[PDB]
Every structure is written in C-alpha cells, then in structure tokens.
Structure 1
Amino acid sequence: AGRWNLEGCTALVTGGSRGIGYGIVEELASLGASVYTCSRNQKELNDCLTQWRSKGFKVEASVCDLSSRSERQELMNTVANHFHGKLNILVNNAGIVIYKEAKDYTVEDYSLIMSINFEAAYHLSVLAHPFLKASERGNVVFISSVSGALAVPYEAVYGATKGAMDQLTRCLAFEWAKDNIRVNGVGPGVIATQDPEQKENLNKLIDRCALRRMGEPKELAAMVAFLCFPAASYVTGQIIYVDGGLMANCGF
C-alpha cells in the first residue's frame, strides 16, 4: 500500500451490512482495499453490494452467523481463499447489545452477547493470524466502545465484553509483534447509525460530547483505515476513541 492508502491490501470486516461496519467497508474500499464482509441478513448484504460496487468499491460478501464456531471457521476458510492466503486487515466490528440491567440478564442473554462481542472477535483473530502473518504487513483493528471503559445504562454486560476485548487487544499487540502484526482498538462513542428513557439516555451522551453531536459512520471509519495505512507503522496496542470528546468529559 502507499503511505496514505490501502492499495493492494485485502481486508475482512465483520458486520459490514450497515451502520459503522458499512462505513468501514466503504472507507477501506475507497482507499483501494478489496473488502470481504458479512452479516446474518441475506437481503441487506446484496443491497450493500449493489451500492458498494456502484461507487466502484471492490467488495465481496456472504451470509454469516458469528455466534457459531463452525460458521466462523468456515468464514475464514472462505475469505482465506478469496485473498489467496494473504490477509492484510481484520476488523472485528461485529457486536450486539441487550438492554437489561446486569441482574436481569438471563443465561441465554449472557452466553449470546459474550459469543458475538468477544469470543467471535477473539476466535476470528486466531483463525486470521496465519494469513495476517503471511501478508507480511498485518493489522487487526477491534471495534470497541466508550462503554468498554466507562459506565453506560443497560450496558453492564455489553461493557464487560468490550473491556475484555480491549485487554486482549493490548496483549495481542505484544504477542503478535514478531509476526509484524499491529493490533489496535477503536472505541466509538455515539455514532449516528424511541423509548422515552432511551431517548434521554442517548441525549445525555450527545450532551456530554464536546462537539455536542453524534458521529457519522465515516468519521469512525476514518480512524480504522488510518491505523491500517503504512503511515501508522509505530501505532499498536492502543484503544483510540472517536467520540467527539465524550471520553474526556466529566462536568461539561
């Protein structure tokens, strides 16, 4: 790739059929990357491919259920073949939230959120490893959240999964250094992708931003792409927040 671009870089973005992931797929594609992404919705992915290839983006996508170990293993094989065994980038963007107090979560709830938020990311990171190391210039960008480090309503368990992800990110930056793989995390705040109380809770977050507004999917994606540029060669083991200043606030 060029210093400030991703020309010739193959990337896998998990969960790129909409919102943030969608923004990340367009962002990396528009910088010359051939992106492979997936989701559960058969119909939504094909509408994405419609628009992506319409803007000229070099993409590819299949349906996936990242809650399944076999589905994840199958995915890597499928993508590892699509790129011929060389993967430059891996964006662990997939995740879900179950709005319930920590004391209301059921076993089915916990197991499901843990599976998609952390285990699925961890697992696809290990599977991707041989190909990232074989790419000569590998990069893993975990999509975390401000919720992974600071308390947000009905996100006690969603935060736990992100806190484990952040720590795994730091550790992999060290463990996979010898394979020329840089591992970083990007924690979004409120990104513009109902219930009276959730409306206010969403309002409290925008209100606590310096910019006093939600971000756009391309604003978070700009940071992911960058971390993949050859220019960011010395950046690794970091959790960088794209949040309009939310993380740094207290009394504003």
Structure 2
Amino acid sequence: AGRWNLEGCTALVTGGSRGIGYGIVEELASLGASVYTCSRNQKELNDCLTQWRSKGFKVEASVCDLSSRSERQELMNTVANHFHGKLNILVNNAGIVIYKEAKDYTVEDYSLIMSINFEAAYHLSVLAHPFLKASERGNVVFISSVSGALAVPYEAVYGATKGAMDQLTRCLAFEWAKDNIRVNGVGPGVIATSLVEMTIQDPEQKENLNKLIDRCALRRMGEPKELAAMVAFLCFPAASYVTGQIIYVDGGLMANCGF
C-alpha cells in the first residue's frame, strides 16, 4: 500500500448495510482496500454488494448478529479465512440507540445496548488481534460519538457505552503498540444517516436534533463520506505516528459552548 492509499490492504467493517458503515466501506474500497462487512440482514447485504461491485470494489459480506458472542467468533473465522489470516483494518462501527431516560431503561434495554455497542466492539477487537498482528501493519478504528464525552438528551446509557469504548481505545494503543497495531477512535457529531431520519420522525427528537445542528460551526449535518474520510486517513501508512487518539468529525460541535 502507498503513502496515501490502501491499495492491497484487507479490511473488516461492521454494520455496513447503511449509514456511516456504508460510507466507510465505499471509501476504503475505493482507495484500494479489499473489504468484508456484515449486517443482520442478508437481502440488504446482497443489494449492497450489487451496488458496490458495479463500481469495481472488491467486497464480500455476510449476515452476523453482533449481540451473539458465538456468532461473533464465527464471523472472525470466516473473515480470517477470506483474507488468509491477514487483516490490516478493523473498523468497529456497528451500534444501536435506545431513546429513553436513564431511569427508564429495562435490564433488557441495557443488556442489549452494552453488548452491541461495547462488548461486541471489544470482543471482535480481541479476536482480530492475531490476524491484525500477522498483517505486520494492523489498524483498529472505533466509531465513538460526541455523546461519549458530553451530555445529550436520551443518550446516558448510549453515551456510557461509547465512553467505555473511548478508554479501551487509549489503552489498547499502548497494549498493542509492540504488535504493530495503531488504535484510534473517530467520534461523529451528527451525520445524515438512517438512524437520524428515524429519530426526526419524533417531533421531540427532531427538536433535540435541530439544537445540535444549530450548535455546530458549520450549522449542518455531516455526510457519511465526510466521516468515512477520517477513518480512511487513519489507515493510510501516512498516519504512522497517530495512535490512541479520539478525533471528532462534528463540524465544530465539540468546541462549542455559547455560540
């Protein structure tokens, strides 16, 4: 792979059937990377591959439910073989939201979200490790969130799962340093995905969301591709010295206080 491209690198992106995941798969594939993705639905995954492959992308995908530990270890075996035991990139993007107050969560809501958003990202992380090592040049990216560092309505537990993700990141950077793996986190602000439109369906979630956009410097939502670009760059060999960092692609949201 060259300094500013991933020509020839193998990558695994979770939750790539839509949104940011879908933008990350396209961005990486278009820069030379060979990709593997997964979602909980096959028909959807297949329609994705149809579009992706008409563009000459090298991509493969398969149905996986990241809340199922056993299914997670199945996916790694499958990807490991697909790439012949060499994986350069692991992009932990899969995530789910549950819009409730902290005191309104059920043990089911909490157990579900902590296993898909954190545990799963952590588990695949550890599973991919030996394959990331054998790549001689591994890279791990976690898709965090601004809500993992600041209070946002209805995202206390959701924010808790990302805040834990952010820390695993910093540590893993030092723990896998000698293994040639660089670990970084990318925190999206507000990106126009399917998760957002489903949100705005609510006349209150819609009101909460227009408050966030009005709090950006750019005063608008990002695009999956503007976000996927940060992820892509971190994997280029030109970012050899960047590790253990949580970078936000939020149009300025993070830096704002009274604007």
Is the pair's TM-score, using the shorter chain for normalization, greater than 0.5? yes
Structure 2 distance, partners of 1:195, 1:127, is: 38
Superposition deviation, residue 10 in structure 1: 0.2
Q: What whole-Å deviation, never above 9, does each CA across 1:28-80 have from its counterpart, x for those lacking one?
A: 00000000000001111111001100111110000000000100000000000
Structure 1 distance, partners of 2:202, 2:227, is: 26
1:185 equivalent in alignment to 2:192: no
Structure 1 distance, partners of 2:99, 2:152, is: 10
Structure 2 distance, partners of 1:190, 1:200, is: 14
Superposition deviation, residue 208 in structure 1: 0.4
Structure 2 distance, partners of 1:201, 1:151, is: 12
Structure 2 distance, partners of 1:89, 1:54, is: 23
Give the ranges of 4+ consecutive aligned residues of structure 1 lying more than 2 Å apart after TM superposition.
none
Superposition deviation, residue 138 in structure 1: 0.1
Q: RMSD over aligned Cα, in angstroms? A: 0.4
Structure 2 distance, partners of 1:197, 1:126, is: 39
Q: What whole-Å deviation, never above 9, does each CA across 1:86-133 have from its counterpart, x for those lacking one?
A: 000000000100000010000000000000000000000000000000
Structure 1 distance, partners of 2:82, 2:255, is: 41
SS of 1:204's equivalent? helix
Superposition deviation, residue 240 in structure 1: 0.2
Structure 1 distance, partners of 2:101, 2:57, is: 41
Q: What whole-Å deviation, never above 9, does each CA across 1:148-169 have from its counterpart, x for those lacking one?
A: 0001110000000000000000
Superposition deviation, residue 195 in structure 1: 1.1
Structure 1 distance, partners of 2:249, 2:85, is: 32
Identity %: 100
Superposition deviation, residue 196 in structure 1: 1.0
Structure 2 distance, partners of 1:174, 1:211, is: 35
Per the alignment, residue 157 of structure 2 pairs with: 157
Per the alignment, residue 36 of structure 1 pairs with: 36
Structure 1 distance, partners of 2:184, 2:214, is: 28
SS of 2:104's equivalent? coil
1:228 equivalent in alignment to 2:235: yes
Q: What whole-Å deviation, never above 9, does each CA across 1:164-193 have from its counterpart, x for those lacking one?
A: 00000000000000001000000000000x
Q: What whole-Å deviation, never above 9, does each CA across 1:196-236 have from its counterpart, x for those lacking one?
A: 11111110011000000000000000000000000000000
Structure 2 distance, partners of 1:21, 1:197, is: 26
TM-score w.r.t. the length of structure 1 is 0.99
Structure 2 distance, partners of 1:235, 1:65, is: 31
Per the alignment, residue 198 of structure 2 pairs with: none
Structure 2 distance, partners of 1:195, 1:83, is: 43
Structure 2 distance, partners of 1:234, 1:114, is: 31
Structure 1 distance, partners of 2:53, 2:186, is: 26
TM-score w.r.t. the length of structure 2 is 0.96
Structure 2 distance, partners of 1:141, 1:96, is: 17
Structure 1 distance, partners of 2:230, 2:203, is: 32
Q: Structure 2 unaligned segments of length 5 or more: list them.
A: 193-200
